Ligand binder design. Structure first.
Ligand SMILES: Nc1ncnc2c1ncn2[C@@H]1O[C@H](COP(=O)(O)OP(=O)(O)O)[C@@H](O)[C@H]1O
Lengths: 48, 97, 322, 435, 193
């Protein structure tokens, strides 16, 4: 059932709040950094 | 990319924080062999210039003294010795008392 | 027939048809008045486009032949096929003088450098390889594409190679130092075909896009890319910017190239049409119902006013330009 | 207080304050005691109040009191004064943000703003797709000092979902009075929009764990961090829930002890008049792309509404669980027609009717299970199109193999079956070798 | 130094908390301003490059846009400084230190992204070949403020240590050497022209 819970959250919001934690969150922030720069936007703080 | 001595000398020359108004001494404490010291031939000469391969040339400020603290000169060439002021500290200078 | 302005016309000259399988690519001989066309039946048939008669078939490939190319002199013919091999044909005697292996999967493109001493190929293992013409040795391996590389095309002076791939991007590489000079991504689908810009077009492009004259005097190499999102984008390699997007094709763009005089853009697509684009005004002038099925490739002769187009209908068509 | 701030020279006067307070008291009694019931029950409560009260009331013979707001001047004003017939931009036709003003929309907007401004938790109850999320977001646009964070409850939802949301969007800081959980950003209120609060399963002892957890955060203003058994006090956090009526399948009635803290507002499906107004506005905005078609805005919208109504009464959750029809399907209808109309420079009326029919088929027939219902849908689409659009080429607009594709052209245009078959065969031939 | 001398004094035990408080204040002031001065100088000679050159937009479009974004953020921060130009308010500005560090990093990246432009610009004036990239950027960006260019002339000419300028600093009246010897131009050169 947890599979369906994660799918529910992902389909409804496009993101799982509890999926990235700890080092995963920092790594994801990294790839989002070069993704935004490498697309053309500047986003420094984590929330944007 | 600047090296240690190049970085120090460039920071002194730029004098962002009033370095030129000070007495800057750069003391090379260690062994002397031509490989690293011959690059200072223009610095210790009347040119007073450090020349980098990138074409940049750094002039020695009048308030900067280049000091070497060495225990021997069995490998230094005549070019380095002739370019510097010699001060000889015999072992008898510092007595056991 | 303005010597730099002819465009193809709906009345076809010949409809050459000897292939038993979809015709993949068609190229013109740089010197002789002869034309070459490879198909998926592992055959490379050679036709004379002045009188429209079959001459001879080059065989030896095991699987479908995907790309064929000539050198500057027109004496050697590099071909690659789906059987993971690249063959070099002595075009005077019509024998395969050398066969090259090394690609791990399907080889979907091949091109001879302008100097004529190296062959650059792109394969489904996401790699580009460089081979010596004399020895047939693999000497360089461009990696960095994340998907199947479809074509590779060097520029005029042979210092850069452009590669399109299923990874949505076109990568411009420096041959000397193997680095990735540029990575151009604006296509929303797979890029099929690319083409470089002839010198005689630079100035035109410079005033077509309104780009100001650089103080260097070189406007910068310009690249084109047709893609499966039914768009043909022309880029400035030097700045990495998409100078323009050309829209109007009804399906995947399979081939794209400049008019030899650098005033028009010739393209073909799976919408069964060959389109002539006035990139001065960023609009398509002419549309030809070239074939009765998908159009796969086209070539535009350097001097003579002829356009050769291959298609999946196993038919290669010659078009006089008036 | 806001009025007095706006009028420093002329503070609020006692007689006008008394009038305002009386009218607002009647208004608040009405919107508190019947905000969670149908329109008929609101009218009944209004009639009872009119029959028993002494406060001055609107003199409209038939318009119920619930249609009147209390102006700051201290007099009743009809809500219709705040519902103008707007003209939406053609590029914002049926966009998710766009809300067409309506009597119900503005009333619920005002009530939601009134409750949210107090940071009081609330629940929006109504049929799925009625407009609860839209209404809440419209209310939150008028309050710049809140973010909404969306949580979607399910039958297996338990408090750890709220815990992860708090972990992401808030932090636990140590203060001398204890541990305080506060949003990472400052000055600005977090509002947790829990979309399915009454879906979480109820154990065999009549309790939903997440409902108890939310009740504990709401009443006691905090919870217990179970890692160290530490009481944590919430700061600058608000809860807003949405849910289908508890009588719907799979939904459980909420606990009364939880309900005493959360006022409930009932947002019903818009009536045929409201649907007509909203989607007539949308269609008028859309049809400006092709001027020659502008005169067909009023039938088409009506036609749409008519068909929608029949579907909503013909297919219900009694037959199949997914036979749910809402204004969301009409929003998708308008979006699809607009997308089909954008690249076309001109189009005869028969083509517009064909696009309408194709969108109706894709929205109302794809989910049908057995063949008879699909036959019913086809026949009734034909009948509705003929009824609202007479004197059109019946065959040219309702040629039965209705297929639309952009595979054979740059735009979304009707496609012949045989051409599409041949093209798909060729694409499959390529697909075999590539994939 | 004075507060440290207080620390070594025997009477400092009753003044622990406030002495350490001013240690913290002064140390944070230095930490902020040491990077802040460098950020200011780098922006000063970067805006000159990105405004005085018309071809930099075409040849370096992406880094151009990077610099306008960074420059708008810097101007916003400077406006916030100007509204409350007391030292503690700017010291107490939320996230001033991290913002300054980010600005320093971004300015450094932009500076290292200008190598080709400076190398090509060296062709116009050949003596630029004997000037480093940092000093060349300082020279080109600060062309308007000729007062700070007097320290670079010794690297470009045999004995022209400094130049002589009028009161307006717009017409070059002559040159000077290290020893003070001066040469007065017969026809002074107008910078404005
Ligand atoms: N007055 C209105 N103006 C604009 N759109 C409306 C209006 N009333 C209903 N809608 C449509 O109804 C849908 C509302 O569904 P939603 O708010 O998501 O329901 P729920 O909150 O139950 O999920 C929206 O897609 C919207 O397009």
């Amino acid at each position: 059932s947890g599979f369906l819970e994660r799918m529910n959250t992902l389909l409804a919001n496009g993101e799982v709040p509890g999926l990235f934690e700890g080092d995963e969150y920092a790594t994801l922030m990294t790839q989002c950094k070069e993704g935004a720069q490498k697309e053309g936007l500047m986003l420094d703080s984590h929330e944007e | 990319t600047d090296g240690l001595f190049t970085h120090v000398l460039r920071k002194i020359i730029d004098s962002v924080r009033g370095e030129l108004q000070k007495r800057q001494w750069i003391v090379f404490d260690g062994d002397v062999d031509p490989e690293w010291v011959e690059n200072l031939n223009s610095v210790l000469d009347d040119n007073k210039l450090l020349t980098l391969p990138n074409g940049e040339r750094l002039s020695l400020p009048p308030n900067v003294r280049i000091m070497f603290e060495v225990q021997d000169l069995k490998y230094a060439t005549l070019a380095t010795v002739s370019r510097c002021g010699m001060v000889w500290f015999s072992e008898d200078v510092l007595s056991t008392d | 027939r303005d010597p730099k302005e002819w465009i193809p016309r709906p009345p076809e000259k010949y409809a050459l048809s000897g292939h038993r399988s979809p015709v993949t690519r068609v190229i013109f001989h740089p010197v002789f008045s002869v034309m070459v066309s490879a198909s998926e039946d592992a055959t490379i048939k050679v036709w004379d486009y002045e009188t429209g008669d079959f001459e001879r078939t080059l065989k030896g490939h095991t699987d479908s032949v995907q790309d064929i190319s000539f050198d500057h002199s027109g004496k050697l013919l590099a071909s690659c096929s789906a059987d993971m091999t690249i063959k070099l044909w002595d075009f005077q005697g019509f024998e395969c003088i050398r066969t090259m292996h090394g690609h791990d999967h399907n080889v979907s493109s091949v091109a001879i450098m302008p100097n004529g001493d190296h062959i650059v190929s792109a394969s489904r293992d996401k790699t580009i390889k460089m081979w010596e013409v004399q020895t047939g040795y693999c000497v360089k391996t461009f990696t960095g594409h994340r998907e199947w590389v479809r074509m590779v095309r060097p520029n005029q002076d042979g210092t850069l190679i452009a590669s399109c791939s299923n990874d949505q991007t076109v990568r411009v590489w420096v041959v000397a130092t193997k680095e990735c000079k540029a990575e151009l991504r604006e296509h929303e689908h797979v890029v099929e075909c690319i083409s470089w810009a002839p010198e005689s077009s630079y100035s035109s492009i410079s005033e077509a896009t309104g780009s100001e004259t650089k103080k260097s005097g070189k406007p910068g190499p310009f690249l084109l890319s047709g893609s499966r999102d039914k768009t043909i984008k022309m880029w400035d390699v030097s700045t990495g910017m998409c100078l323009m997007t050309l829209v109007g094709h009804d399906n995947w763009v399979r081939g794209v190239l400049f008019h030899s005089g650098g005033k028009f853009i010739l393209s073909c697509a799976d919408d069964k049409t060959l389109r002539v684009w006035d990139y001065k005004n960023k609009r398509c002038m002419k549309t030809l119902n070239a074939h009765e099925h998908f159009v796969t490739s086209l070539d535009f002769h350097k001097t003579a006013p002829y356009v050769v187009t291959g298609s999946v209908d196993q038919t290669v068509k010659v078009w006089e330009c008036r | 207080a806001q009025y007095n701030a706006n009028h420093p020279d002329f503070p609020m006067q006692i007689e006008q304050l008394e009038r305002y307070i009386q009218r607002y008291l009647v208004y608040a009694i009405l919107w508190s005691l019947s905000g969670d019931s149908r329109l008929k029950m609101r009218a009944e409560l209004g009639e009872y109040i009119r029959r028993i009260t002494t406060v001055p009331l609107p003199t409209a013979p038939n318009i119920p009191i619930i249609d009147y707001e209390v102006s700051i001047s201290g007099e009743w004003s009809p809500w219709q004064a705040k519902v103008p017939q707007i003209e939406v931009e053609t590029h914002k036709v049926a966009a998710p943000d766009v809300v067409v003003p309506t009597l119900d929309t503005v009333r619920h907007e005002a009530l939601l703003y009134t409750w949210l401004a107090e940071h009081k938790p609330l629940v929006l109850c109504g049929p799925p797709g009625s407009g609860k999320t839209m209404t809440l977001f419209s209310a939150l646009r008028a309050l710049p000092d809140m973010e909404v964070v969306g949580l979607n409850f399910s039958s297996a939802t338990t408090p750890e979902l709220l815990l992860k949301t708090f972990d992401h969007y808030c932090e636990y800081r140590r203060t001398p009075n204890g541990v305080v959980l506060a949003p990472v950003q400052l000055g600005k209120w977090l509002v947790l929009f829990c979309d399915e609060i009454n879906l979480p399963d109820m154990d065999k002892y009549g309790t939903q764990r997440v409902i108890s957890f939310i009740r504990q955060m709401v009443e006691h203003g905090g919870f217990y961090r179970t890692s160290d058994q530490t009481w944590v006090k919430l700061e600058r956090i608000q809860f807003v829930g949405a849910c289908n009526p508890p009588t719907d399948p799979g939904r459980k009635p909420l606990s009364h002890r939880f309900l005493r803290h959360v006022p409930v507002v009932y947002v019903d499906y818009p009536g045929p008049a409201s649907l007509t107004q909203i989607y007539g506005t949308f269609n008028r905005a859309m049809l400006r792309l092709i001027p020659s078609l502008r005169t067909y805005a009023e039938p088409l919208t009506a036609a749409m509404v008519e068909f929608y109504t029949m579907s909503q009464e013909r297919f219900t959750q009694d037959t199949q669980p997914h036979y749910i029809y809402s204004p969301r399907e009409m929003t998708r209808w308008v979006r699809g027609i607009f997308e089909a109309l954008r690249p076309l420079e001109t189009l005869p009326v028969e083509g517009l009717i064909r696009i309408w029919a194709h969108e109706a088929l894709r929205l109302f027939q794809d989910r049908l299970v057995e063949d008879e219902e699909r036959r019913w849908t086809d026949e009734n689409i034909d009948t509705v199109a003929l009824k609202h659009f007479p004197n059109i080429d019946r065959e040219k607009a309702m040629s039965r193999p209705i297929l639309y594709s952009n595979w054979l052209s740059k735009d979304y245009i009707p496609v012949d079956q045989e051409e599409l078959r041949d093209y798909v065969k060729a694409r499959l031939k390529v697909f075999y070798e590539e994939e | 130094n004075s507060v440290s001398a207080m620390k070594l004094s025997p009477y400092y035990k009753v003044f622990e908390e406030d002495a350490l408080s001013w240690e913290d204040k002064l140390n944070r002031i230095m930490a902020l301003f040491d990077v802040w001065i460098d950020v200011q100088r780098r922006w000063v000679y970067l805006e000159g490059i990105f405004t005085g050159s018309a071809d930099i937009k075409h040849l370096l479009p992406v880094e151009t846009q990077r610099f306008q974004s960074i420059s708008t953020e810097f101007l916003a921060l400077m406006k916030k400084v100007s509204k409350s130009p007391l030292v503690m308010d700017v010291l107490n500005i939320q996230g001033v230190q991290r913002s300054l560090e980010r600005l320093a990093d971004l300015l450094g990246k932009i500076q290292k992204a200008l190598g080709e432009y400076l190398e090509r610009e060296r062709s116009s004036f050949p003596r630029f070949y004997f000037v480093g990239d940092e000093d060349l950027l300082e020279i080109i960006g600060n062309s308007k403020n000729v007062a700070k260019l007097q320290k670079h002339f010794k690297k470009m000419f045999a004995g022209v240590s400094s130049i002589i300028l009028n009161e307006d600093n717009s017409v070059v009246l002559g040159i000077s050497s290290r020893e003070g010897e001066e040469v007065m131009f017969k026809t002074p050169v107008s910078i404005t022209e």
